[PDB]
Design a protein around this nucleic acid. Structure first.
Lengths: 61, 161, 171
RNA sequence: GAAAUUGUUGAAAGGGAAGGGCAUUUGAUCAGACAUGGUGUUUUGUGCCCUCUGCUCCUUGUGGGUAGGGGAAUCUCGCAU
């Protein structure tokens, strides 16, 4: 199990899992790179505007 | 029981011990010397002599286990011996010296040395009357005061059987 | 508690009983000795200081308490009486200083700590009083012990601190 | 439980390739070096340093293992120093 390369205190860092998901690698990786760098209270509100067609998710690679 | 009792000096009442140095021999000790006694590498022995449930005597000594880099004085070093002038002529100092000799004998030692001022004759005769021996004469510049006063000191030794 | 043993009587008698008591105490002290009987000597000095403090006397009481401190400076009651005399003479800061110095001699009693905190609150000194009180209190989710003092259901501390706040606001 | 392979962190790079030979600036990384071997002097704690020498076993020549003391200003015979 475990995770990846972390650089913080694991004592106060919560995380989940939920394996076996039939989605899409190109979409999951892109939305993970897009949601990274923002706060939780902002990420919970940014996802509500995607279904309303206001701020789309661009692509990089 | 007897009116003269003995007690082990704790830390909470340690502030009382520092007061003794201010009502016995002023201009000799400081505050860090008493604060570093129970600050959690020399062995320190503390004793408080009560007279009718009243703190009247204090004894603070240090044990020196070294003998390689020392001439001949390994034993209990009687540092602080505070006895109020109003609480004398009642074998209080005798009981303190007996307790010191007992603690010296229990620590596998057979020598007790003490330092005394050179400008005091009554205390010198009182300590000699118990059974001490003077080591040589005086020591040039040994006692350091609070403001910066310096004077000579004498050494009194005793062999414990 | 010798003075306490004659505390209510002094509230009902005066010029008829107190002179005889003072004469008896003086006659008993004139036959004592500062070395043979030190305990009766210091207790007689304390009783005389209490009796003179009750009779609106202050210089002689200070002289007696100073003689008692010079004879045996290992009693908290002497420092408490000195602080009380200095408070009655309008010297709150000096009384607080002497009582803190005496309390630092033995840090295990809570009554002396409460008295010191109260006298510091009466001396327009609130920060130092709180810092002194924040010792025996439970320190968990707070930097001091104000929450602990409020959880142990206090009253006198709050009353004495609010009076100091009111005095500082009126100044 | 290794590989092509995508994912995050950390470092480099860029004007139609990257990769490499001879050599190097820069970043990251790394053992070796005897900066620990000895001579001889000053030092103390001290031991098998003077010593009360004991208990126990092979046999000369000067006898092997086991432990509590008196002074440490003799001695560098020993380790740190």
């Amino acid at each position: 199990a475990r995770y990846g390369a972390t650089s913080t205190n694991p004592a106060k860092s919560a995380s989940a899992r939920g394996s076996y998901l039939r989605v899409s690698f190109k979409n999951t990786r892109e939305t993970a790179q897009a949601i990274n760098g923002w706060e939780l209270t902002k990420a919970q509100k940014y996802l509500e505007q995607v279904l309303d067609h206001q701020r789309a998710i661009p692509f990089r690679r | 029981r007897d009116i003269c009792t003995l007690d082990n000096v704790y830390a909470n009442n340690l502030g009382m011990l520092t007061k003794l140095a201010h009502v016995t021999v002023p201009n000799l000790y400081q505050d860090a010397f008493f604060s570093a006694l129970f600050a959690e590498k020399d062995v320190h022995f503390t004793q408080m002599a009560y007279y009718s449930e009243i703190p009247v005597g204090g004894l603070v000594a240090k044990l020196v286990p070294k003998k390689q880099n020392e001439l001949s004085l390994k034993g209990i070093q009687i540092e602080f011996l505070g006895v109020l002038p109003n609480y004398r002529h009642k074998s209080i100092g005798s009981k303190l010296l007996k307790f010191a000799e007992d603690k010296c004998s229990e620590c596998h030692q057979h020598n007790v040395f003490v330092y005394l001022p050179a400008v005091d004759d009554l205390t010198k005769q009182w300590f000699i009357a118990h059974g001490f021996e003077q080591v040589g004469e005086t020591v040039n510049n040994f006692i350091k005061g609070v403001n910066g006063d310096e004077q000579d000191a004498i050494l009194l030794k005793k062999h414990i059987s | 508690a010798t003075f306490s043993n004659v505390k209510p009587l002094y509230q009902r008698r005066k010029s008829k009983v107190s002179p005889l008591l003072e004469k008896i105490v003086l006659d008993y002290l004139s036959g004592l000795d500062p070395t043979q009987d030190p305990i009766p000597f210091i207790w007689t000095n304390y009783y005389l200081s209490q009796h003179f403090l009750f009779l609106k006397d202050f210089p002689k009481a200070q002289e007696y308490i100073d003689a008692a401190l010079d004879h045996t400076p290992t009693l908290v009651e002497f420092y408490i009486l000195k602080a009380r005399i200095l408070k009655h003479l309008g010297l709150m800061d000096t009384a607080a200083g002497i009582l803190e110095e005496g309390r630092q001699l033995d840090l295990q009693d809570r009554f002396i700590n409460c008295k010191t905190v109260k006298y510091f609150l009466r001396a327009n000194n609130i920060d130092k009083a709180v810092e002194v009180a924040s010792l025996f209190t439970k320190n968990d989710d707070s930097v001091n012990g104000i929450k602990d003092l409020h959880l142990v259901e206090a009253s006198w501390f709050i009353v004495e601190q609010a009076e100091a706040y009111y005095r500082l606001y009126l100044d």
